[PDB]
Design a protein around this ligand. Sequence first.
Ligand SMILES: Cc1cc2nc3c(=O)[nH]c(=O)nc-3n(C[C@H](O)[C@H](O)[C@H](O)COP(=O)(O)O)c2cc1C
Ligand SMILES: Cc1cc2nc3c(=O)[nH]c(=O)nc-3n(C[C@H](O)[C@H](O)[C@H](O)COP(=O)(O)O)c2cc1C
Ligand code: NI
Lengths: 306, 307
Amino acid sequence: SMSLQVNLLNNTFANPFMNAAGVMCTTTEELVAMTESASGSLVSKSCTPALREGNPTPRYQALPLGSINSMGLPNNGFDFYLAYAAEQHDYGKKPLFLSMSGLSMRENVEMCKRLAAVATEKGVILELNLSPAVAYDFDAMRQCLTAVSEVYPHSFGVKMPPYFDFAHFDAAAEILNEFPKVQFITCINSIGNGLVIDAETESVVIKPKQGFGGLGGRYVLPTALANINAFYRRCPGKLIFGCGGVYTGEDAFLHVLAGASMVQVGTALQEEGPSIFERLTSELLGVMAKKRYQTLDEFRGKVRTL
Amino acid sequence: GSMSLQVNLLNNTFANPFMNAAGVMCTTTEELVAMTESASGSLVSKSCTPALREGNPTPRYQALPLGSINSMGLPNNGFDFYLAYAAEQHDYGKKPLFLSMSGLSMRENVEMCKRLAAVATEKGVILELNLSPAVAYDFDAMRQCLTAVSEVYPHSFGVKMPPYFDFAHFDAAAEILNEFPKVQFITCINSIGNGLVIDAETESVVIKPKQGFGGLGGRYVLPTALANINAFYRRCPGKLIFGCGGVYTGEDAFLHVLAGASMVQVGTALQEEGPSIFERLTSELLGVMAKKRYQTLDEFRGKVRTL
Ligand SMILES: Cc1cc2nc3c(=O)[nH]c(=O)nc-3n(C[C@H](O)[C@H](O)[C@H](O)COP(=O)(O)O)c2cc1C
Ligand SMILES: Cc1cc2nc3c(=O)[nH]c(=O)nc-3n(C[C@H](O)[C@H](O)[C@H](O)COP(=O)(O)O)c2cc1C
Ligand code: NI
């Protein structure tokens, strides 16, 4: 007998799967579809205080090894997602995360002040997007978390861009550990500012920023696993959510082995739609069956070093 | 049409833009001779320290479907060895030679450069100074290092860079590099640092040092490499860019050059296939150029179209 159940943040989740923020979670229809899916949870599109059109198109391109995008935070605005969380989400089906991505400290502070009562009343959980990106400037990062912690009377998580050396893992973890309200860390947002060139057209493939954009998919799995495990080790008091390169149950298995509690799906979900979650739960159970595991706790964070 | 892969830079002529990446098949005399005998346009010797280094415990390199992961730890025969190869053994009649230097402190690099100067003068060996927390990730330390080396090394040289991941960092690094006219080329990029490969079957990491964390190469890194190549191509118009990262085919090389590359270095692919790869890559790049109606590299270098 097996189970994908996860228990964390005073909630129970049927399985660890959820969408990545930015993917299939912008409109009412999308949020409802995520709620009706087999996913264990969902997160609403990273929001700004007011609606944002986002960058000019094309701004997303699917690729053999993943995706590249420079969406530019298109979203319906904070009021919209707050109302979804306050009055529409069926918390009886699954828990809900709200992703917040204010463009200044002030914006985050203002939104958090209003989110507080809805979190208290309904149980929505904040995922604060820190992905130059806030998390790549340690002073800006400390300031952001100080501000939010000061005005937001609840636990929350942070969505991180990837780091690429131990000095940075140490520096980031030192900061995160100074904030006990940060109860989860989502690793990772894209690998930033890659450049895809189409040999046939001799051109870039997205319009904004001269073709530079965030990489997702197969490209990022080892970087994601690195960041998941690095923070799993360095922030023992916190949960880690995995994000990056999940297409299969086996991929998800790797995230959990590295330390992941929840596993977010981006590029693969963009291409397949919310039905992917039935496939992913099935595949992960199958991997666990073949390896003789009954629960996620049996192998979470147990990757073997040499 | 008669096409040419010729490249001209730093008072040298290169038959084609291809060379090995530093770290790959360039450690021993036998390897250096084989690179020289190959169809490559050039070669670079293994990044050296002042004295020989055994490197990290094995396993420390693993080939992967989408590339490679490694934590070699700078195993090398020592500066004396590569200096001797450059001064006395290398056939400059066959192709130009780059020497990769990777001191573990600013002082080590300074002392090696003092001694390399005479050999650069006499034989024409070209320095690629490895700046890959990595020196290049510490802007003050980077400026400091380039100042100290420029002070003692009266020759043009290049720097090998780790990748950056945002415009603010592209600008900051370019600003520093633009302070040093002796830095005539920039090699982008070394490796995507500290990835972690986990083998689902064994439920373990695949290399031994650093709990399995190591540098990524191959298919994983091509868009990051192209971004860095083009970012510096744009921001350092007075310098040349050498590409490194994700080259398996002539088409990949075409992309490097489109992004701004003058020379194109081959790492993971070369590790897996050996030096015969250069015959294949030259032939493939010429084929790509023939199909796209280009005769020379200068016709499309850095000409990637934005939308
Ligand atoms: C179309 C698109 C939009 C995204 N927007 C957001 C976003 O609003 N907030 C966020 O934290 N991450 C955003 N991201 C990054 C994803 O959340 C995720 O971190 C990344 O795609 C890695 O997962 P993948 O490898 O599964 O694609 C976006 C990604 C894509 C592809
Ligand atoms: C085995 C191995 C050893 C390496 N050692 C060095 C080195 O000594 N000096 C250096 O600048 N880069 C070193 N690197 C990085 C490579 O030069 C190259 O930048 C990287 O592998 C990306 O190219 P690829 O995608 O073609 O593998 C090494 C890479 C590999 C795979
Ligand atoms: Ni930094």
